[model samples]
Target: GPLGSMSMELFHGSYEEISEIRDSGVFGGLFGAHEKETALSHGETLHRIISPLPLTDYALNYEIESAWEVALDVAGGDENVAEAIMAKACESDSNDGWELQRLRGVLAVRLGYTSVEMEDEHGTTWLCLPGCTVEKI
Candidate 1:
């Protein structure tokens, strides 16, 4: 047997609240320092912005993809740092969800450092292209 039908209104509400929780400082702290550490070691810096949303009935149900907005904030350009950031972004959380299932789908790193913006099936915009030029525009 599969999970019962989920209420749109209730799902939206919970999604909103969970989004806030995920965006809060606590969540950022979960990965912010790690990015900084990776940067320090590889002479490059990286940052990520996570956006969570409720998904319609489909394969698995809930899904999330992190926007890997990486920045090469170092004296010299480090390709390793960029690769590390991409790998980290694709990682999956080991924690269990409220229903005991290991959450849903993993957070896969689709596009890495692009100048153009792309949209998903849900028409959500994912504009996380890394700018080669470090200087401000």
Candidate 2:
């Protein structure tokens, strides 16, 4: 039974009903059981994460020195961009936080990026740009 747009009814159901739906495999179809569609949706999310605005910030201040320079040039030396880039870099690096890596995974899934480049110093993971090679310092 295809629910079409009636899927909202499922959300309104009691926990038991939702559990039953999950056990019946009906929930899968409702929540993108189709692999291709799910993948495409994830790809879109990644694209937004990799938007020039954020990437520009991530690359310049945190990941690579050359990338930062390039981003600055591209942004026409905008001080605001530089500040954002520096802030993100500090947030990701100063404490070995996983926040940036999590963001990268999210963005990677949305952008349909099949491969992830990460730098792990200690236990924290940092996402690397596609097509960019990492050299550890």
Candidate 3:
């Protein structure tokens, strides 16, 4: 009734004799590891992070800012908002992932900011700089 291996109990031994015994015992043989990958390539996915203009510029000029946070922050930090917005943009465009990724910069600028600053060639944009600001029509 006493011929099997047992986990070494702490009180089974004394601290004074701790170093005398190899308390670190083996329970069983084991091995493990973790891995991941990202398909993020050039264009929007990359440019969104590497924006040409400062995020503040968007806020100051056109009231273009994050929908959730202060005007200085990026539009989509959780990936949820960005994905949804970009997906919609993609649908309106060529409806392609690569094409959407290509437009990340524009999408982010436009979405994060609000309107297309047509006067500026560097692709500057706007937001509420108003729903009812009617044109001459």
Candidate 4:
């Protein structure tokens, strides 16, 4: 129940997705998409793709990559700030995984933001580490 106060305003853009995640309570990241395609799978390794920019807001300000806007809590768990920084420095690439955690974590500490934000093409995005639980808003 304490987590109830911890939720943050986060959004996701998807032409088709998130419904399953909402139902399953697990929001898989980019890597999870690959699992749906082939027999082989990464298994348990999934990262969630999210952003503060709403889909409608983006269309009004940008283009229609055409997606349904899904909202959720950006900060609903114990994301270790130290681990995030170490991961980013160690990974050094921001492509995926710990690096993102690092960036978000560092930014979280620097800006005093619980819903950690990361630089993206449009505005900013948030990456939920693999196996993180997602709450629909």
- Compare the candidates by lDDT and give the number of the best one: 4
In candidate 1, what are the lDDT values of residues 11-105, reduced to their tens digit? 11111112122312321211111133332342233333332222222211122232323212220234444333222121224322211111111
lDDT of each candidate versus the true structure: 0.22, 0.30, 0.25, 0.31
Report lDDT (Cα) of residue 26, candidate 1: 21
Q: Which sections of candidate 1 miss by over 4 Å?
A: 1-19, 22-76, 89-137
TM-score of 2: 0.23
Which residue pairs clash within candidate 2? 42-110, 43-110, 45-110, 46-107, 46-110, 46-111, 60-68
lDDT string, candidate 3, 32-54, tens digits: 00111111211111111111222
Query: Model 2, 17-111: lDDT tens per residue?
Result: 22111212311111211133322442332111111111333443465545444434533576444333344332323333343334433343334
Give the residue spans of candidate 3 off by over 4 A. Answer: 1-94, 111-137
- Encode model 4's per-residue lDDT on 1-137: one tens digit a residue: 34334443433433343433331222223211212222123232223333222222233223422111211112223234323332223223324444444444433333322333333333344443322343322
> Which rank order by lDDT, best down to worst?
4, 2, 3, 1
- Better TM-score candidate (2, 4): 4
Model 3: per-residue Cα lDDT at residue 33: 9
Cα TM-score per model:
0.19, 0.23, 0.18, 0.30
